[PDB]
Amino acid sequence: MLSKTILDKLNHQVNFEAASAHLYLQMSAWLLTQSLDSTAAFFRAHAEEEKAHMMKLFDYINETGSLALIGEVATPAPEWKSHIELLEAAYNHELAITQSINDLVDTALREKDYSTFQFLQWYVAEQHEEEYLFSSMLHKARIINTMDGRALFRFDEEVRKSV
Amino acid sequence: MLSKTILDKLNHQVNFEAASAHLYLQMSAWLLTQSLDSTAAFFRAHAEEEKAHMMKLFDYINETGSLALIGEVATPAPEWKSHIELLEAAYNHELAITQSINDLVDTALREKDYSTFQFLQWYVAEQHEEEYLFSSMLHKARIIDTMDGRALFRFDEEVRKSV
Amino acid sequence: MLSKTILDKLNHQVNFEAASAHLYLQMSAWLLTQSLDSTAAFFRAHAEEEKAHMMKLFDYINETGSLALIGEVATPAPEWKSHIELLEAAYNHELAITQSINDLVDTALREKDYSTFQFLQWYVAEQHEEEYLFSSMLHKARIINTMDGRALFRFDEEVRKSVL
Amino acid sequence: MLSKTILDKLNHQVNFEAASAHLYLQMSAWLLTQSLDSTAAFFRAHAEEEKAHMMKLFDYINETGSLALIGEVATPAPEWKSHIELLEAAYNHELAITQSINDLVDTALREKDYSTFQFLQWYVAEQHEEEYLFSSMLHKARIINTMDGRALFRFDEEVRKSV
Amino acid sequence: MLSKTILDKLNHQVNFEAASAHLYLQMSAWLLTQSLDSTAAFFRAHAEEEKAHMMKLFDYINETGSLALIGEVATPAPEWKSHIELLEAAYNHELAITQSINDLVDTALREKDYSTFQFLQWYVAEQHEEEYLFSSMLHKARIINTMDGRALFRFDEEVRKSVL
Amino acid sequence: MLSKTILDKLNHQVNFEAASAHLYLQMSAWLLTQSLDSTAAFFRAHAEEEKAHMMKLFDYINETGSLALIGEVATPAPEWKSHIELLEAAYNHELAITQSINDLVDTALREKDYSTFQFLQWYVAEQHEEEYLFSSMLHKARIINTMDGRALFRFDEEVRKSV
Amino acid sequence: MLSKTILDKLNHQVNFEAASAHLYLQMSAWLLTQSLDSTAAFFRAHAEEEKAHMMKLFDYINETGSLALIGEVATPAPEWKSHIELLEAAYNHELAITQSINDLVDTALREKDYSTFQFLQWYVAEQHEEEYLFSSMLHKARIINTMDGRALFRFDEEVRKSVL
Ligand SMILES: [Fe+3]
Ligand SMILES: [Fe+3]
Ligand SMILES: [Fe+3]
Ligand SMILES: [Fe+3]
Ligand SMILES: [Fe+3]
Ligand SMILES: [Fe+3]
Ligand SMILES: [Fe+3]
Ligand SMILES: [Fe+3]
Ligand SMILES: [Fe+3]
Ligand SMILES: [Fe+3]
Ligand SMILES: [Fe+3]
Ligand SMILES: [Fe+3]
Ligand SMILES: [Fe+3]
Ligand SMILES: [Fe+3]
């Protein structure tokens, strides 16, 4: 049932989600060497989310009667010079995942594979939540990197406690 | 992330939903002067539904990283000469909202903004329920405005009680 | 039953409360662009409070037999250059609402509309709580904007954890 | 502690509330001769409300150290030619009570008897609810007395069941 | 926000309620020397009520952004020659508190400080309850000071047991 | 039963505890004008503790058959130029209360009033808790007033969260 | 706040209670080599009590604003030739602790350090319980070391089962 062009892209996405999990594990490890334990925990937990994204694609492909393929996943050693450089990478990575999902949705629509189109709506929605999460965490890291910013956040925290 | 054309239309829709809430509040107030207390209660409750429609758009916009805008909302004083004229206005208003949502869906599809496209599906579905609700209430009002009609409804009520 | 002068002022207040809700929604949206998420949440929640103020007026008017009117509500785009400028605007706005309620109470008393006078006592009380809430939030923002102030609040927070 | 002018007016009000109870009992009895059983039940129940209004005044007076007086209460036999005439009489009677309460509030304010002023606010609020209740019931009775009106109410009842 | 004339009067009232608490504590102590243990307990408990009146004023003042002031409170040693003389003093003291609250209400109305006016309604209502309580206790003490009176109360107590 | 010298000192202490309550209320009020809301709450609550210390003395005196006297309590308006000056005043005030209790204990021992000696042990214990509380709060305020100090506390707070 | 003489004695006592815990642990270990398992358990559990005595002193000192000092604690290897010799050493050790507490109480009284005096009353009471516990255990060990004694205890045990 799946066309070869769609199958190859779905398998590419399986592999991409797998690579994301590994990337976020690797980030988690690096963060622990900086004593950023909560950020490390976030990336660890989020690696588990990427695994679930992977498995859901993997299952869809197999349910259609084609054979899902994991492929090669290569995770570069940690280059990152600061936590902000790492958060920029994470956010750009999530933008690239969104691009890949959008290309996939577009090609399903173009081939009139409506079944794959509707299956992918879950991912379109999930990537909105992902971009919000990662862009927001980056934005806050940049602000907290400044003294003026830390003062803003001190006021915001006062509002969280007081009202 | 949001294109300017889609942002301006989403903000237009925010403002439209806000205007709907105010419209239905105003209709409620007029209906009370006619002693149509249950219809008034329906329009009051439904103003709260429109507020929820508004907020959900407002949140989506803000989550994407753009700034949602409420704008100007102008509610004309009650012109209505009968409850049927009011129900016609409500139904036409809901048709216009559906038009506006469809235009928005169409333009997201055209720009390949699949994220906004999938976000809007909730509204497409909700507007089907809205049209059904308002058209049906109008149709009943027209029937109940005739003696033959009030006899039909008396039978239908007998069936509701008997079986 | 309601005199025209009181009706016009109650309908003005309906509209004013509606404009407050929108104003606070708009402030919430701006605050999110500054990553002030808790302050944004506070203004969002408070927009809901202003809606309740509106509805309560709206219902009173309708219960008396008159027709409540929503009117035009115009919310300017966000001008604000800082969170402090926004909190000043919010506080001044709340002072204006109080003024408007006081005028309304005064005119009910003058016309001997004792029914509207007593209905409004809820608002007089509520506006005392509103001014306290917003003035206090502004004051804390000004303090926290200074290093000496942040140190005071660090001590206060130590007291919240250690004793109270 | 109470001035003579205020005491005489509070006692007048005690008597006025007592007369209202008896008036509403008498109306209830008349309504039963017309087979208006639900309206009769409403007036019967409301006679009990007027008694509570009476007792609360009665107590306030006694708590201040003065002697509450019931006085003479005379209830005319039922003149009423229709249920609308009776509802008009009930509404006008409630207006008169409100007048009497307003005169009492005004005179407490004028004498700077702030204690009686604040005690009466309960009555000012209650009379707003009473006027709403009785005006609304009269309005509906007038509407339901016409065929056009009975058609409006049939639609309103449809809305109560349908939504 | 509070005018100086209203602030000064609210602070005066804070101080007056504080003095009441101390007065009633002192009365309690005297009553114990007369073996009037239940009356002593009543005054002791009531001192706690007066403290609550004080704190509620104190909080309002601070919430408006002004600074509440406790001031000097002087409690004279117990002069009282009988329990009736003490109950008279308590009743007159409550009459004076009512006067002071009425003056405060009147001045809030005159300045159109409707916020303080509505805040004070609680006190107007409470002072009605206080005058009822204290006048009634005094009246009973006077009656029970007579033979004829003790016979009336004996009948009233028989009704409390037999019927009510 | 109580000697005049012990009675006069116990009554002095009653008055001293009453003055402490009023002092702490006044400090609370001043602290609110500085937006130090938690510190204000602490002093407000602690005024209630002082009012308990007072009552316990007041009851003991009365139970011995003497007449407890409240006396004159004068609370100066708030002079304080900073929160540290206020805390210093509070701590010194607590040192003076301890001195007064000690003098009282010493004089009960000297007169062989063992009953008052043992009654006062509660206060000797309580004042140890009071001095610990107030000294510790003052010390932290002085530390937090320095940048080096704020850094120490940031570490200490990290230990509270981490372990 | 603490005088240098009282501090030095409270720290000495901290160290004395620490040495008691270690002493009783060491006694426990020796008793296990004699197969006196219950007596070993008692001393083990009691070492934990001595630790609590230590910590309570340690805390008091620190709360006053001085620095508590543990010092050197030296526990000799087990010399004991019999369980009775050990119980004698334990009892005498408890007598010495009591002496030390008394000296401390006496010095606090002399310096009019009433705060340390009242804190120490807990220990005075506790040491009464300790002497009772250890003297009684020694007394029983001496009795049970004789045949006449073992017969008395057999009767006492019969009373524990039959009546009490
Ligand atoms: Fe993913
Ligand atoms: Fe992702
Ligand atoms: Fe809608
Ligand atoms: Fe709609
Ligand atoms: Fe409002
Ligand atoms: Fe407001
Ligand atoms: Fe009534
Ligand atoms: Fe009535
Ligand atoms: Fe009071
Ligand atoms: Fe009082
Ligand atoms: Fe104290
Ligand atoms: Fe103290
Ligand atoms: Fe020990
Ligand atoms: Fe021991």
CB-based burial, C94-133: b 16+ in 10 Å, e otherwise = bbebbebbbebbebbbeeebbbbbbbbbebbebbbebbbb
Residues A14 and A68: beta-carbon distance below 8 Å: yes
Tokens 């087979």 belong to residue: D35
Closest to D47 (Cα-Cα) out of D26, D71, D70 = D26
Chain E: residue nearest D60 by CA? Answer: E128
Give me the numbers of helices (H) and strands (E) for chain D, helices first please.
5, 0
Chain C: residue nearest B72 by CA? Answer: C74
What resolution (Å)? Answer: 2.6
Q: Which amino acid is at D6?
A: I
* Torsions phi, psi for B72 (to 5 deg): -95, 135
Rounded to the nearest whole angstrom, what is the distance from the C-alpha of residue C58 to the centroid of ligand 8? 24
> For residue C72, what is the enclosing H or E element?
strand C72-74
Cα–Cα distance measured from residue F99 to residue F113, given in angstroms and rounded to the nearest whole number: 19
Closest to C138 (Cα-Cα) out of B67, E7, A162 = A162
Q: Name the pairing type of β-strands C72-74 and B72-74.
A: antiparallel
Residues F72 and E74: beta-carbon distance below 8 Å: yes
Q: Is D121 annotated as a binding residue?
A: no
Q: Is B85 annotated as a binding residue?
A: no
**Interface test mutation site (partner C, options F46, F49, F135, F144, max chain C beta carbons within 10 A):** F144
Rounded to the nearest whole angstrom, what is the distance from the C-alpha of residue F129 to the centroid of ligand 11? 10
* Torsions phi, psi for G112 (to 5 deg): 50, 35
> For residue C137, what is the enclosing H or E element?
helix C114-144
HEC string of G67-111? CCCCCCCCCCCCCCCCHHHHHHHHHHHHHHHHHHHHHHHHHHHHC
C-alpha distances in Å from residue G146, one per residue of C96, G36, G143: 98, 18, 6
Which method, experimentally, gave rise to this model? X-ray
Domain F1-163 has CATH 3.40.50.10140: no
Chain C: residue nearest A143 by CA? Answer: C35
CB-based burial, D63-81: b 16+ in 10 Å, e otherwise = bbebebeeeeeeeeeeebe
Size of interface F-G (CB pairs under 8 A): 26
Give every CB contact of residue D125 below 8 A, 6+ residues apart in sequence: C115, C118, C119
Taking an 8 Å cut-off on Cβ atoms, the answer to whether B144 and D151 are in contact is: yes
- For residue G119 the two structure tokens come to 């804190």
User: Considering only CB atoms, which residues of chain D are within 8 Å of chain C?
Assistant: 98, 101-102, 105-106, 121, 124-125, 127-128, 131-132, 135
Taking an 8 Å cut-off on Cβ atoms, the answer to whether D114 and E132 are in contact is: no
Cα–Cα distance measured from residue E27 to residue E78, given in angstroms and rounded to the nearest whole number: 7
- For residue A94 the two structure tokens come to 């999530």
Give the annotated binding-site residues of A for Fe(3+): 17, 50, 53, 94, 130
Rg (CA), chain E: 19
**Interface test mutation site (partner A, options C36, C86, C143, C158, max chain A beta carbons within 10 A):** C36
Rounded to the nearest whole angstrom, what is the distance from the C-alpha of residue C30 to the centroid of ligand 6? 19
Cα–Cα distance measured from residue B51 to residue C25, given in angstroms and rounded to the nearest whole number: 12
Cα–Cα distance measured from residue B63 to residue A139, given in angstroms and rounded to the nearest whole number: 13
Helix axes G4-33, G83-110, angle to 10 degrees: 170
**Interface test mutation site (partner D, options C64, C110, C113, C114, max chain D beta carbons within 10 A):** C114
Rg (CA), chain B: 19
Cα–Cα distance measured from residue B19 to residue B15, given in angstroms and rounded to the nearest whole number: 6
Q: Is E79 annotated as a binding residue?
A: no
Please list every residue in chain B whose beta carbon sits closer than 8 Å to the beta carbon of residue D160: 38
* Torsions phi, psi for B74 (to 5 deg): -120, 125
- For residue A63 the two structure tokens come to 């349910």
- Count of residues in chain D: 163
Cα–Cα distance measured from residue E144 to residue F51, given in angstroms and rounded to the nearest whole number: 35
* Torsions phi, psi for F72 (to 5 deg): -100, 135
Tokens 């009736």 belong to residue: E84
Cα–Cα distance measured from residue G142 to residue F40, given in angstroms and rounded to the nearest whole number: 65
Chains G and D touching, counted as 3 or more CB pairs less than 8 Å apart? no
Residues F117 and F105: beta-carbon distance below 8 Å: yes
Please list every residue in chain B whose beta carbon sits closer than 8 Å to the beta carbon of residue D156: 35-39
Cα–Cα distance measured from residue C90 to residue C80, given in angstroms and rounded to the nearest whole number: 11
User: Considering only CB atoms, which residues of chain F are within 8 Å of chain E?
Assistant: 18, 22, 25-26, 29-30, 32-33, 51, 58, 61-62, 65, 67-75, 77-78
- Count of residues in chain C: 164
CB-based burial, F8-35: b 16+ in 10 Å, e otherwise = ebbbbbbbbbbbbbbbbbbbbbbbbebb
Architecture in CATH for domain E1-164: Up-down Bundle (1.20)
Q: Which amino acid is at E130?
A: E
Residues F75 and F23: beta-carbon distance below 8 Å: yes
CA dihedral of E34, E39, E42, E46, whole degrees rounded to 10: -70
- For residue D42 the two structure tokens come to 């409403």
Residues A143 and C42: beta-carbon distance below 8 Å: no
HEC string of G23-60? HHHHHHHHHHHCCCHHHHHHHHHHHHHHHHHHHHHHHH
> For residue E69, what is the enclosing H or E element?
none
> For residue D14, what is the enclosing H or E element?
helix D4-33
Closest to B48 (Cα-Cα) out of A139, C51, E163 = C51
Taking an 8 Å cut-off on Cβ atoms, the answer to whether F78 and E71 are in contact is: no
3-state helix vs strand vs coil in chain A, percent to 5: 80, 0, 20
* Torsions phi, psi for E80 (to 5 deg): -60, 135
| Residue from the list C37, C133, C153 with its beta carbon closest to the beta carbon of A158 | C153
Tokens 């102030």 belong to residue: C149
Taking an 8 Å cut-off on Cβ atoms, the answer to whether D155 and B145 are in contact is: yes
Chain D: residue nearest B148 by CA? Answer: D151
Cβ atoms within 10 Å of B146's Cβ, excluding its own: 11
Query: Which residues is B72 bridged to in the sheet?
Result: C74
Tokens 């010298």 belong to residue: F5
Three-state secondary-structure class, residue F149:
helix
Cα–Cα distance measured from residue G101 to residue B53, given in angstroms and rounded to the nearest whole number: 77
> For residue F74, what is the enclosing H or E element?
strand F72-74
By CB atoms closer than 10 A (0-12, 13-18, 19+), residue C77 is: exposed
Three-state secondary-structure class, residue D77:
coil
Chain D: residue nearest C64 by CA? Answer: D132
Query: Which residues is F73 bridged to in the sheet?
Result: E73
Cα–Cα distance measured from residue F71 to residue D56, given in angstroms and rounded to the nearest whole number: 43
Rg (CA), chain F: 19
C-alpha distances in Å from residue F71, one per residue of E21, E82, F61, G55: 13, 21, 14, 43
- For residue E108 the two structure tokens come to 């809030």
Give every CB contact of residue B33 below 8 A, 6+ residues apart in sequence: C65, C67
Please list every residue in chain F whose beta carbon sits closer than 8 Å to the beta carbon of residue C154: 144, 150, 153
Closest to F141 (Cα-Cα) out of F20, F19, F39 = F39
- For residue G145 the two structure tokens come to 């070391």
| Residue from the list C39, C42, C150 with its beta carbon closest to the beta carbon of A151 | C150
